[PDB]
Amino acid sequence: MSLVNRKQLEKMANVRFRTQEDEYVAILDALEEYHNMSENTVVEKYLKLKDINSLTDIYIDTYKKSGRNKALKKFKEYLVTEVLELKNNNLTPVEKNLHFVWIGGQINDTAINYINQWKDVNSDYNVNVFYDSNAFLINTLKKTVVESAINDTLESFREDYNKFFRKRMEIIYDKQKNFINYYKAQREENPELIIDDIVKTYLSNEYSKEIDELNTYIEESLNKITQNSGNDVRNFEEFKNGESFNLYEQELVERWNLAAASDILRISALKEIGGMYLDVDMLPGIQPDLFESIEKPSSVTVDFWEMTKLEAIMKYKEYIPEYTSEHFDMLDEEVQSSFESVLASKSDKSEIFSSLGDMEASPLEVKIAFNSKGIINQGLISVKDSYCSNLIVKQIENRYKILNNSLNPAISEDNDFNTTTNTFIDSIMAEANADNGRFMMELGKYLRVGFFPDVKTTINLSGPEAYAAAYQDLLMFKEGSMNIHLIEADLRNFEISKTNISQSTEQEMASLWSFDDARAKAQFEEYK
Amino acid sequence: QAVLTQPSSLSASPGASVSLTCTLRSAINVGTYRIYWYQQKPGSPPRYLLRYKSGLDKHQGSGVPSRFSGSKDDSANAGILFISGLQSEDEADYYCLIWHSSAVVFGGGTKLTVLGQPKAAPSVTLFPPSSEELQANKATLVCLISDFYPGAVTVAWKADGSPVKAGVETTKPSKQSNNKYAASSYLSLTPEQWKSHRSYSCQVTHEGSTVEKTVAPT
Amino acid sequence: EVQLVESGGGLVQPGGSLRLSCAASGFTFRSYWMHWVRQVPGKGLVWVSCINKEGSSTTYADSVKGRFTISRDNAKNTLYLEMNSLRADDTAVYYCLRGYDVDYWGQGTLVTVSSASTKGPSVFPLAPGGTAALGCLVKDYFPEPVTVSWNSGALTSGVHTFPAVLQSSGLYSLSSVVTVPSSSLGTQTYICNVNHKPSNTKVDKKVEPKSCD
């Protein structure tokens, strides 16, 4: 179909004995201008003459009592729908680029084994495994501090927990705030020091680290990542000129939140390069035809049948040794024979895993992945400079701009942990809004990110909440939505097909440790 | 000019490093496209080579040696194909691609000649029309250029010293058994013309030098 | 192992039709776009037609617009090209290749568009400088596959058959030469064996040094 045209809209919003107002015609005129736009592309179709909504919302704020309001309100609904027809019927090929991120430490072999599976089936794709060459010791310095944060916590605790994690975060913040002052100072005296220089100096002075054996970890980390596809380094001239950089350095150096710096990187790299981002815990999709002859038992969850598939493929083909048969080893030999026979009747990796190939997506969209708890950015697809990718970056940029207008005042007062939290909570409660009510609540937990349970701030800043907020800005014809009011059935429009990714891997299945009440006093017993 | 233009041919010695250019006319075109490179060793179909669009949007075909690399030289709008550590196994024709107003456009092609053998001069042999091919009417002179390594010659016939190219079809050089080159050229006539002029020549030019044979009706 | 093998090429009257068929194996024949590209033998590469993953939209070159049709059968993993109203411009080798950003090429099938009809060859001897040489002249024939051995295939050192050349009359001619010692010339017979397969002819000619008075 299409959208309603000028004659049609004239029928809907007609009121007998009521002439056409100056602004009512502005809507009819722009709508007619729209349907004479076949020579134009998708992007400037979406705005140049597909706002309309603007000229419509103008009519409803001038003539608040007009009869046509009820009809034009439905007209705005047909505009959201036409945007989805635009997204689904005009698709261009996607850049054959695959993006991974490993920053802060040495890449371990399990991550390389998962990446090598994408290269073998998709031999027509560039593989970039982004790393920060200047910050290999950010994971090393994070461990050292919390290690020492417990030695000093238990030193003054001669008689529980809760009070443990409470009085531990106070120490971590002081050792954190101490390092940030050393960094901001070292960078002033010597602008030529990189992050790694400052960290091995701080780790050697205040923690007696064999710095002889530290510059070895740096040499091995680069030698490893550089011969495994690499295609990266702290390069990116367009990422460093962009406003999103000192946001990434803030989560990296001032915060030691390795993942939150990756959340900022992935969406910016997709917008500037194009391609498809994946966490290193993801595996290529399985050929949909492979195990159709092995009926799944009706007394078994769907997730179980999904992991057992990958575990079987890794048992009789051994692409990845040391992959657990943990879930496969619980079927009778009547069923394990069904897998071994099917894994015999294939002889190539691309007979088992589906390749991506010539993918295509819309210039407006950024395709996001799904699980049981909503959208998740363990897999993203976007064409270069897609309209959604720009909205997600402005959304994350806008959300951090809010975070720092209230947090940086309290950091500058250099008090302890609790006086700084009280100053920071009032500042978000001051410049608070009725729109961002759901947002500013999760913001108060920001200092505890990485060191406590029940902290959902990272999600509301540069995670799923920001992506959905960008999808709303797309579908509501606005920018800067803070309160999500899109239903789940709406967001599945930007879903990534289950046959392009394999999520139930051993790895991202092994990163579901709850760390809450189901822990109960434990882990402290480890500390001996 | 012509959307996307390459040089005709270039030669270099083994071990040397070369760079081929795929220039593309100025105007509605810059260096924000991909450049797709291809190698076609003669007698065979092309081979995918590279794809370079940016530092992060580049690719090398499976099996392409690491000595092939691509970049783009700005100010000249051209894409480049570095081949360092040249060898005789790299002698081929090279084409680039670009996606334009839809469709897809090729370049002219660069006949890269990697010389890895001792150079040789042509051995020109000029045959008159035989007694048989004269009873059947028809008169055909055969100029046969054999054994020479720089496989690029220029043939041109002469009659009584004056030049003539009316009625000449000529083959291009081809590899022979001893890995050198050889080309042939024919001149069709009529028995009236063969019996009228005094001399016939065929003159080839190869590396500035100019061999010139000559026969005559005796 | 990705392989693409095309077929259907042959010899056609100018105006006739042909159906080329590239058959795909080794990859998911969906998932990817496909192209056709022709190469006039001895000249550069030239693009022809391109089809979608699903075959919904297609783009043709200005030369073959209206005359050519691209078709794609995702079941029988095979591509098609239907060539109507053939000129002599269309004589070339046609390759099928894969992907939007294009990756792998096929073997290439040859298509020739000429008017003349099959004719056997005429063979004339080239009778005898430090060693001197001799040869055979095979001219005026059609279908190009003309093979030439020497002395029923006796010795092959010194033999070089040249590539054929198309004459104005639409007929091919080639020559084959062989270098023999000037000593053994005379009292040692050198014949050449022309074998024209499509016209079902085999001429055997003995070259002996010309006698002049």
Coordinates of N, CA and C in Angstrom, one line a residue, chain B residues 24-165:
Chain B
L24 N 40.0 7.6 -11.8 CA 38.6 8.0 -11.7 C 38.4 9.5 -11.8
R25 N 37.6 10.0 -12.8 CA 37.6 11.4 -13.1 C 37.1 12.2 -11.9
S26 N 37.5 13.5 -11.9 CA 37.1 14.4 -10.8 C 35.6 14.8 -11.0
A27 N 35.1 15.5 -10.1 CA 33.7 16.0 -10.1 C 32.9 15.3 -9.1
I28 N 31.9 14.6 -9.6 CA 30.8 13.9 -8.7 C 31.4 12.7 -8.0
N29 N 32.8 12.6 -8.1 CA 33.4 11.4 -7.5 C 34.6 11.8 -6.7
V30 N 34.8 11.2 -5.6 CA 36.0 11.5 -4.7 C 36.6 10.1 -4.3
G31 N 37.1 10.1 -3.0 CA 37.7 8.8 -2.5 C 36.9 8.2 -1.4
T32 N 35.6 8.3 -1.4 CA 34.7 7.7 -0.4 C 34.0 6.5 -1.0
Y33 N 34.6 5.8 -1.9 CA 34.1 4.5 -2.5 C 35.0 3.4 -2.1
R34 N 34.6 2.2 -2.4 CA 35.6 1.1 -2.3 C 36.3 0.9 -3.7
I35 N 37.5 0.3 -3.6 CA 38.3 0.0 -4.8 C 38.5 -1.5 -4.7
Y36 N 38.0 -2.2 -5.7 CA 38.1 -3.7 -5.8 C 39.1 -4.0 -6.8
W37 N 40.2 -4.7 -6.4 CA 41.3 -5.0 -7.3 C 41.2 -6.5 -7.8
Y38 N 41.7 -6.7 -9.0 CA 41.6 -8.0 -9.6 C 42.9 -8.3 -10.4
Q39 N 43.3 -9.6 -10.3 CA 44.4 -10.1 -11.0 C 44.0 -11.2 -12.0
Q40 N 44.4 -11.1 -13.3 CA 44.0 -12.0 -14.3 C 45.3 -12.4 -15.0
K41 N 45.9 -13.5 -14.6 CA 47.1 -14.1 -15.2 C 46.6 -14.6 -16.6
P42 N 47.3 -14.3 -17.7 CA 46.7 -14.5 -19.0 C 46.3 -15.9 -19.2
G43 N 45.2 -16.1 -19.9 CA 44.6 -17.4 -20.2 C 43.7 -17.9 -19.1
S44 N 43.4 -17.1 -18.0 CA 42.7 -17.6 -16.9 C 41.7 -16.5 -16.5
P45 N 40.7 -16.8 -15.7 CA 39.7 -15.8 -15.2 C 40.3 -15.0 -14.1
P46 N 39.7 -13.9 -13.8 CA 40.2 -13.0 -12.8 C 40.3 -13.6 -11.4
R47 N 41.0 -13.0 -10.5 CA 41.1 -13.4 -9.1 C 40.9 -12.1 -8.3
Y48 N 40.0 -12.3 -7.3 CA 39.8 -11.3 -6.3 C 41.1 -11.0 -5.5
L49 N 41.3 -9.7 -5.2 CA 42.6 -9.3 -4.6 C 42.4 -8.5 -3.3
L50 N 41.8 -7.3 -3.5 CA 41.7 -6.4 -2.3 C 40.3 -5.7 -2.5
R51 N 40.1 -4.8 -1.5 CA 38.8 -4.1 -1.4 C 38.9 -2.7 -0.8
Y52 N 40.0 -2.4 -0.1 CA 40.3 -1.2 0.6 C 39.3 0.0 0.3
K53 N 38.6 0.4 1.3 CA 37.9 1.7 1.3 C 38.4 2.6 2.4
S54 N 39.0 2.1 3.5 CA 39.4 2.9 4.6 C 40.3 2.0 5.4
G55 N 40.9 2.5 6.5 CA 41.7 1.7 7.3 C 41.0 0.6 8.0
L56 N 39.7 0.8 8.2 CA 38.8 -0.2 8.9 C 37.9 -0.9 7.9
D57 N 37.8 -0.5 6.6 CA 37.0 -1.1 5.6 C 37.9 -1.6 4.5
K58 N 38.7 -2.6 4.8 CA 39.6 -3.2 3.8 C 39.6 -4.7 3.9
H59 N 40.1 -5.4 2.9 CA 39.9 -6.8 2.7 C 41.0 -7.3 1.7
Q60 N 41.5 -8.5 2.0 CA 42.3 -9.2 1.0 C 41.7 -10.6 0.8
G61 N 41.7 -11.0 -0.5 CA 41.1 -12.3 -0.9 C 41.9 -13.4 -0.3
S62 N 41.1 -14.5 0.0 CA 41.7 -15.7 0.6 C 42.8 -16.3 -0.3
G63 N 44.0 -16.4 0.1 CA 45.1 -16.8 -0.6 C 45.9 -15.8 -1.3
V64 N 45.5 -14.5 -1.2 CA 46.3 -13.4 -1.8 C 47.5 -13.2 -0.8
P65 N 48.8 -13.2 -1.4 CA 49.9 -12.9 -0.5 C 49.8 -11.6 0.2
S66 N 50.5 -11.5 1.3 CA 50.4 -10.3 2.2 C 51.1 -9.1 1.5
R67 N 51.9 -9.4 0.5 CA 52.6 -8.3 -0.2 C 51.7 -7.3 -1.0
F68 N 50.5 -7.8 -1.3 CA 49.5 -6.9 -2.0 C 48.8 -6.1 -0.9
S69 N 48.8 -4.7 -1.2 CA 48.1 -3.8 -0.3 C 47.4 -2.7 -1.1
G70 N 46.4 -2.1 -0.5 CA 45.7 -1.0 -1.2 C 45.5 0.1 -0.3
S71 N 45.6 1.3 -0.9 CA 45.3 2.6 -0.2 C 44.7 3.5 -1.2
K72 N 44.5 4.8 -0.8 CA 44.0 5.8 -1.8 C 44.9 7.0 -1.6
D73 N 45.4 7.6 -2.6 CA 46.2 8.8 -2.6 C 45.2 9.9 -2.9
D74 N 45.0 10.8 -1.9 CA 44.1 11.9 -2.1 C 44.7 12.9 -3.0
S75 N 44.0 14.0 -3.2 CA 44.5 15.1 -4.2 C 44.4 14.6 -5.6
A76 N 44.6 13.3 -5.8 CA 44.6 12.7 -7.1 C 43.4 11.7 -7.3
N77 N 42.6 11.6 -6.3 CA 41.3 10.8 -6.4 C 41.5 9.3 -6.7
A78 N 42.8 8.9 -6.8 CA 43.1 7.6 -7.3 C 43.2 6.6 -6.1
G79 N 42.9 5.3 -6.4 CA 43.2 4.2 -5.6 C 44.5 3.5 -6.0
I80 N 45.1 2.9 -5.0 CA 46.5 2.4 -5.2 C 46.5 0.9 -4.9
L81 N 47.5 0.2 -5.5 CA 47.7 -1.2 -5.4 C 49.3 -1.4 -5.2
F82 N 49.7 -1.3 -4.0 CA 51.1 -1.6 -3.7 C 51.4 -3.1 -3.9
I83 N 52.4 -3.4 -4.6 CA 52.9 -4.8 -4.7 C 54.4 -4.7 -4.4
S84 N 54.8 -5.0 -3.2 CA 56.2 -5.0 -2.8 C 56.7 -6.5 -2.9
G85 N 58.0 -6.6 -3.1 CA 58.6 -7.9 -3.3 C 58.1 -8.6 -4.6
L86 N 58.3 -7.9 -5.7 CA 57.8 -8.3 -7.0 C 58.4 -9.6 -7.4
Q87 N 57.6 -10.4 -8.2 CA 58.1 -11.7 -8.7 C 57.5 -11.9 -10.1
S88 N 58.1 -12.9 -10.8 CA 57.6 -13.2 -12.2 C 56.2 -13.8 -12.1
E89 N 55.8 -14.4 -11.0 CA 54.5 -14.9 -10.8 C 53.4 -13.9 -10.6
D90 N 53.8 -12.6 -10.6 CA 52.8 -11.5 -10.5 C 52.5 -10.8 -11.9
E91 N 53.2 -11.2 -12.9 CA 52.9 -10.7 -14.3 C 51.5 -11.0 -14.7
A92 N 50.7 -10.0 -14.9 CA 49.2 -10.2 -15.2 C 48.7 -8.9 -15.6
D93 N 47.3 -8.9 -15.8 CA 46.5 -7.7 -16.0 C 45.8 -7.4 -14.7
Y94 N 45.6 -6.1 -14.4 CA 45.0 -5.7 -13.2 C 43.9 -4.7 -13.4
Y95 N 42.7 -5.0 -12.9 CA 41.5 -4.1 -13.1 C 41.0 -3.7 -11.7
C96 N 40.3 -2.5 -11.6 CA 39.6 -2.1 -10.4 C 38.1 -2.0 -10.6
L97 N 37.3 -1.9 -9.5 CA 35.9 -1.7 -9.6 C 35.5 -0.5 -8.8
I98 N 34.3 0.0 -9.1 CA 33.5 0.9 -8.4 C 32.0 0.8 -8.7
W99 N 31.2 0.8 -7.6 CA 29.8 0.9 -7.8 C 29.4 2.4 -8.0
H100 N 28.8 2.7 -9.2 CA 28.4 4.1 -9.5 C 26.9 4.3 -9.3
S101 N 26.4 5.1 -10.2 CA 24.9 5.3 -10.3 C 24.2 4.0 -10.5
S102 N 24.1 3.1 -9.5 CA 23.9 1.7 -9.6 C 25.0 1.2 -10.6
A103 N 24.7 0.0 -11.2 CA 25.7 -0.6 -12.1 C 27.0 -0.8 -11.4
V104 N 28.0 -1.3 -12.2 CA 29.4 -1.4 -11.7 C 30.3 -1.3 -12.9
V105 N 31.4 -0.5 -12.7 CA 32.3 0.0 -13.7 C 33.7 -0.5 -13.5
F106 N 34.4 -1.0 -14.6 CA 35.7 -1.5 -14.5 C 36.7 -0.4 -15.0
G107 N 38.0 -0.7 -14.8 CA 39.0 0.2 -15.3 C 39.6 -0.4 -16.7
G108 N 40.5 0.4 -17.2 CA 41.1 0.0 -18.5 C 42.0 -1.2 -18.4
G109 N 42.7 -1.4 -17.3 CA 43.6 -2.5 -17.1 C 45.0 -2.1 -17.3
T110 N 45.9 -2.7 -16.4 CA 47.3 -2.4 -16.5 C 48.1 -3.7 -16.8
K111 N 48.7 -3.8 -17.9 CA 49.5 -4.9 -18.4 C 50.8 -4.8 -17.7
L112 N 50.9 -5.3 -16.5 CA 52.2 -5.3 -15.8 C 53.1 -6.4 -16.3
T113 N 54.3 -6.0 -16.7 CA 55.3 -6.9 -17.2 C 56.5 -7.0 -16.3
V114 N 56.6 -8.0 -15.5 CA 57.7 -8.3 -14.6 C 58.7 -9.1 -15.4
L115 N 59.9 -8.5 -15.7 CA 60.9 -9.1 -16.5 C 61.9 -9.9 -15.7
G116 N 61.8 -11.2 -15.8 CA 62.7 -12.1 -15.0 C 63.5 -13.1 -15.9
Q117 N 63.8 -12.6 -17.1 CA 64.6 -13.5 -18.0 C 65.5 -12.6 -18.8
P118 N 66.6 -13.1 -19.4 CA 67.4 -12.3 -20.3 C 66.7 -11.9 -21.5
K119 N 66.8 -10.6 -21.8 CA 66.1 -10.0 -23.0 C 66.7 -10.6 -24.2
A120 N 65.8 -10.7 -25.3 CA 66.2 -11.3 -26.5 C 65.6 -10.5 -27.7
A121 N 66.3 -10.5 -28.8 CA 65.9 -9.8 -30.0 C 65.1 -10.8 -30.9
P122 N 64.2 -10.2 -31.7 CA 63.3 -11.1 -32.5 C 64.1 -11.7 -33.7
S123 N 63.6 -12.9 -34.1 CA 64.2 -13.6 -35.2 C 63.1 -13.6 -36.3
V124 N 63.2 -12.7 -37.2 CA 62.2 -12.4 -38.3 C 62.5 -13.3 -39.5
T125 N 61.5 -14.1 -39.9 CA 61.6 -14.9 -41.1 C 60.5 -14.6 -42.0
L126 N 60.8 -14.2 -43.2 CA 59.8 -13.7 -44.2 C 59.7 -14.7 -45.3
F127 N 58.5 -15.3 -45.5 CA 58.2 -16.3 -46.5 C 57.4 -15.7 -47.7
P128 N 57.9 -16.0 -48.9 CA 57.1 -15.6 -50.1 C 55.9 -16.5 -50.3
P129 N 55.0 -16.1 -51.2 CA 53.9 -17.1 -51.5 C 54.5 -18.3 -52.2
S130 N 53.9 -19.5 -51.8 CA 54.4 -20.7 -52.4 C 53.8 -21.0 -53.8
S131 N 54.4 -22.0 -54.4 CA 53.9 -22.3 -55.8 C 52.5 -22.8 -55.7
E132 N 52.1 -23.5 -54.7 CA 50.7 -24.0 -54.6 C 49.8 -22.8 -54.3
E133 N 50.0 -22.0 -53.4 CA 49.2 -20.8 -53.0 C 49.3 -19.7 -54.1
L134 N 49.3 -20.1 -55.3 CA 49.5 -19.1 -56.4 C 48.8 -19.8 -57.6
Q135 N 48.7 -21.1 -57.7 CA 47.8 -21.8 -58.6 C 46.4 -21.6 -58.1
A136 N 46.2 -21.5 -56.8 CA 44.8 -21.3 -56.3 C 44.5 -19.9 -56.3
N137 N 45.0 -19.1 -57.2 CA 45.0 -17.6 -57.1 C 45.6 -17.3 -55.7
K138 N 45.3 -16.1 -55.2 CA 45.6 -15.7 -53.8 C 47.2 -15.5 -53.7
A139 N 47.6 -14.5 -52.9 CA 49.0 -14.2 -52.7 C 49.1 -13.8 -51.2
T140 N 49.9 -14.5 -50.4 CA 50.0 -14.3 -49.0 C 51.4 -14.4 -48.5
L141 N 51.9 -13.3 -48.0 CA 53.2 -13.3 -47.4 C 53.1 -13.4 -45.9
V142 N 54.0 -14.2 -45.3 CA 53.9 -14.6 -43.9 C 55.2 -14.1 -43.2
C143 N 55.1 -13.2 -42.3 CA 56.2 -12.6 -41.5 C 56.1 -13.3 -40.1
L144 N 57.1 -14.0 -39.7 CA 57.1 -14.8 -38.5 C 58.2 -14.3 -37.5
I145 N 57.8 -13.7 -36.4 CA 58.7 -13.1 -35.4 C 58.8 -14.1 -34.3
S146 N 60.0 -14.6 -34.0 CA 60.2 -15.7 -33.1 C 61.3 -15.3 -32.1
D147 N 61.2 -15.8 -30.9 CA 62.2 -15.8 -29.8 C 62.6 -14.4 -29.4
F148 N 61.9 -13.8 -28.5 CA 62.3 -12.5 -27.9 C 61.5 -12.3 -26.6
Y149 N 62.2 -11.8 -25.6 CA 61.6 -11.8 -24.3 C 60.7 -10.6 -24.0
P150 N 61.2 -9.3 -24.3 CA 60.3 -8.2 -24.1 C 59.1 -8.3 -25.1
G151 N 58.1 -9.0 -24.8 CA 57.0 -9.4 -25.7 C 56.1 -8.3 -26.1
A152 N 56.7 -7.2 -26.7 CA 55.9 -6.1 -27.2 C 56.6 -5.6 -28.4
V153 N 56.0 -5.9 -29.6 CA 56.6 -5.5 -30.9 C 55.7 -4.7 -31.7
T154 N 56.1 -4.1 -32.8 CA 55.3 -3.3 -33.7 C 55.7 -3.7 -35.1
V155 N 54.8 -4.3 -35.8 CA 55.0 -4.7 -37.2 C 54.4 -3.8 -38.2
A156 N 55.0 -3.7 -39.3 CA 54.5 -2.8 -40.4 C 55.1 -3.2 -41.7
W157 N 54.3 -3.4 -42.7 CA 54.7 -3.9 -44.0 C 55.1 -2.7 -44.9
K158 N 56.0 -3.0 -45.9 CA 56.3 -2.0 -46.9 C 56.4 -2.7 -48.3
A159 N 56.0 -1.9 -49.3 CA 56.1 -2.4 -50.7 C 56.9 -1.4 -51.5
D160 N 58.1 -1.8 -52.0 CA 59.0 -0.9 -52.8 C 59.5 0.2 -51.9
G161 N 59.6 0.1 -50.6 CA 60.0 1.1 -49.7 C 58.8 1.9 -49.2
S162 N 57.8 2.2 -50.0 CA 56.6 2.9 -49.5 C 55.9 2.0 -48.5
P163 N 55.2 2.6 -47.6 CA 54.4 1.8 -46.6 C 53.0 1.6 -47.1
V164 N 52.4 0.5 -46.6 CA 51.0 0.1 -46.9 C 50.5 -0.8 -45.8
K165 N 49.3 -0.5 -45.4 CA 48.6 -1.3 -44.4 C 47.2 -1.8 -44.9

